């Protein structure tokens, strides 16, 4: 409610009140910003991480690996400081593929070596921590390696570390996945990719995790419309009948959730089926913060 009705970037006491709102109890908003769509990567992009709304809690840096070096330069030198100025946490996202890479030894030394290499992706940018994207089951060997790496990371990130840095588990699977059963003690937040899902199915999914967390750790995810992407239908008009909107309102029975996140926050407000790149004032993000914290 100390948040702007447009997308101003407040400067003094207007900003301080937003800095205090964020230290206060609230349902948090998170956004995956696709790095290859940042104006500092390639050409033809319309949106910068500098445009992210002041009332955002976490920005994920989600690369695909063909971003131009200019992106990483701007992230370290410009973007991270300005987002930290707005009290926005910046977190690097990486796929589970990275933690089960067989180029790294499946041994204590190997789990530590790999954790060191992922920790460079955090420390070299002054980031607030690391997000691991899990969308697959693992064999015994993969499970063993991923668990080892989570356990090595847990020394520097998340609840076991005492650093204040985040260790995030984001997934489209449930709390029965063996990796989850191995690593839940290491986790800051768990984010459920819930694109195009039943409002009626939400409780069932939460219940699969609720024994391993408090409800403030749990966030649910909708997607914005990706240019040439899957039509999940999470952002239909009118807004206040959207799946995203109903996600902002949903609470598990007898408890309050952590909040929600968007995939492709860089696509906030682009109509479903509009495959061109546009700018955004982050209307949906800002509305959806209001919807969770009225
Ligand atoms: C093969 C393919 O297209 N895979 C995509 C993933 O690339 C994408 O991240 C994922 C995102 O949506 C999540 O997973 C799906 C299966 C479903 O459970 C959604 O509700 C989740 O949000 O979509 C895959 O289909």
φ, ψ at 56 (rounded to 5°): -70, 140
What sign results for the dihedral spanned by CA atoms 24, 30, 35, 38? negative
DSSP 190-208: EEEE-TT--GGGHHHHHHT
* C-beta 172 within 6 A of ligand 1: yes
CA of 189 to the centre of ligand 1 (A): 20
> What is the spatial distance between Cα 54 and Cα 282, in angstroms, rounded to a whole number?
10
**Structural element, H or E, at residue 222:** strand 218-223
> What is the spatial distance between Cα 67 and Cα 219, in angstroms, rounded to a whole number?
28
Q: Residue 182 burial by CB count (10 A; 0-12/13-18/19+): exposed, middle or buried?
A: middle
Return the bridge partners of 59, or none.
Answer: 31, 90
Any idea where the domains of the chain sit in the sequence? Answer: 1-294
> What is the spatial distance between Cα 214 and Cα 159, in angstroms, rounded to a whole number?
13
Return the bridge partners of 192, or none.
Answer: 171, 220
Q: Residue 265 burial by CB count (10 A; 0-12/13-18/19+): exposed, middle or buried?
A: buried
The interaxial angle of helices 108-123 and 140-153, nearest 10 deg, is 50
8 Å CB contact between 260 and 27: yes
> What is the spatial distance between Cα 221 and Cα 169, in angstroms, rounded to a whole number?
13
CA of 194 to the centre of ligand 1 (A): 9
Q: CA angle 77-94-260, nearest 5°?
A: 90
- Closest among 44, 39, 40, 32 to 276, alpha carbons compared: 44
Residue carrying the six token digits 């909107």: 245
DSSP 19-86: HHHHHS---EEEEEEEGGGBTTSSSS--B-GGGS-TT--EEEEE--S---HHHHHHIIIIIHHHHHHT
> What is the spatial distance between Cα 40 and Cα 48, in angstroms, rounded to a whole number?
7
> Ligand 1 atom 14: the closest Cα is on which residue?
172
Report how this structure was experimentally obtained: X-ray
* C-beta 243 within 6 A of ligand 1: no
φ, ψ at 99 (rounded to 5°): -95, -10
| Ligand 1 binding pocket mutation candidate from 195, 223, 233 (most atoms within 8 A of CB) | 195
> Ligand 1 atom 19: the closest Cα is on which residue?
195
> What is the spatial distance between Cα 235 and Cα 50, in angstroms, rounded to a whole number?
23
Ligand 1 atom with the smallest distance to the CA of 221 is 22
* C-beta 93 within 6 A of ligand 1: no
* C-beta 136 within 6 A of ligand 1: no
- Closest among 138, 266, 262, 245 to 191, alpha carbons compared: 262
- Closest among 273, 266, 230, 223 to 63, alpha carbons compared: 266
Return the bridge partners of 191, or none.
Answer: 170, 219
Helix, coil or strand: residue 236? coil
CA of 156 to the centre of ligand 1 (A): 30
- Closest among 67, 132, 55 to 99, alpha carbons compared: 132
CA of 107 to the centre of ligand 1 (A): 31
**Greatest CA separation for the chain:** 54
8 Å CB contact between 58 and 64: no
| Ligand 1 binding pocket mutation candidate from 97, 133, 135 (most atoms within 8 A of CB) | 135
DSSP class of residue 267 equals G
**Structural element, H or E, at residue 105:** none
CA of 19 to the centre of ligand 1 (A): 34
Query: 1-18 burial, b for 16+ CB within 10 Å, e for fewer?
Result: ebbbeebebbeeeebeeb
> Pseudo-torsion of CA 81, 83, 86, 91, nearest 10°?
-110
- Token digits of residue 14: 């207007």
Return the bridge partners of 261, or none.
Answer: 30, 221
Q: How far apart are the first and last CA of the chain?
A: 7
- Token digits of residue 282: 């982050």
- Closest among 133, 131, 102 to 118, alpha carbons compared: 131
> What is the spatial distance between Cα 86 and Cα 88, in angstroms, rounded to a whole number?
5
Helix, coil or strand: residue 149? helix
> What is the spatial distance between Cα 229 and Cα 273, in angstroms, rounded to a whole number?
8
Ligand 1 atom with the smallest distance to the CA of 193 is 22
CA of 58 to the centre of ligand 1 (A): 21
**Structural element, H or E, at residue 288:** helix 283-292
Stated in angstroms to one decimal place, the resolution of this structure is: 2.1
* C-beta 195 within 6 A of ligand 1: yes
> What is the spatial distance between Cα 191 and Cα 206, in angstroms, rounded to a whole number?
11
> What is the spatial distance between Cα 225 and Cα 266, in angstroms, rounded to a whole number?
10
* C-beta 250 within 6 A of ligand 1: no
> What is the spatial distance between Cα 291 and Cα 98, in angstroms, rounded to a whole number?
36
Helix, coil or strand: residue 266? helix
Q: Tell me the CB-side half-sphere exposure of residue 37, using CA atoms within 13 A.
A: 21
8 Å CB contact between 117 and 123: no
> What is the spatial distance between Cα 137 and Cα 152, in angstroms, rounded to a whole number?
21
> Ligand 1 atom 7: the closest Cα is on which residue?
135
| Cα–chain center distance at 74 | 20
> Ligand 1 atom 18: the closest Cα is on which residue?
172
Q: How many CB atoms lie within 10 A of CB 166?
A: 21
């Amino acid at each position: 409610s100390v948040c702007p009705s447009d997308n101003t970037h407040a400067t003094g006491a207007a900003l301080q009140k937003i800095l205090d709102y964020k230290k206060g109890d609230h349902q948090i908003m998170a956004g995956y910003f696709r790095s290859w769509r940042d104006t500092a990567s390639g050409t033809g992009n319309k949106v910068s991480m500098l445009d992210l709304p002041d009332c955002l809690d976490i920005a994920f840096v989600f690369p695909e690996g063909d971003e131009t070096a200019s992106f990483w330069t701007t992230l370290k030198d410009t973007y991270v400081p300005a987002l930290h100025g707005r009290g926005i946490k910046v977190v690097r996202s990486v796929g589970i593929a990275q933690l089960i890479n067989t180029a790294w030894d499946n041994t204590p030394a190997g789990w530590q070596g790999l954790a060191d290499a992922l920790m460079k992706t955090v420390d070299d940018y002054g980031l607030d921590g690391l997000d691991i994207n899990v969308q697959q089951s693992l064999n015994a060997n993969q499970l063993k390696q991923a668990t080892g790496v989570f356990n090595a990371l847990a020394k520097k990130l998340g609840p076991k570390s005492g650093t204040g840095k985040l260790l995030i588990f984001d997934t489209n699977m449930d709390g029965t996945q063996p990796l989850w059963r191995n690593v839940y003690p290491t986790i800051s937040y768990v984010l459920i990719q819930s694109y195009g899902r039943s409002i009626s199915g939400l409780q069932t999914t939460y219940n699969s995790f609720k024994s391993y967390i408090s409800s403030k750790q749990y966030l649910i995810g909708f997607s914005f419309y990706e240019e040439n992407g899957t039509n999940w239908g999470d952002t239909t008009t009118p807004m206040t009948s959207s799946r995203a909107w109903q996600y902002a309102k949903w609470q598990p029975s007898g408890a309050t959730k952590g909040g929600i996140f968007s995939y492709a926050i860089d696509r906030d407000g682009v109509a479903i089926g509009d495959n061109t790149l546009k700018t955004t004032d982050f209307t949906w993000t800002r509305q959806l913060i209001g919807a969770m914290n009225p």
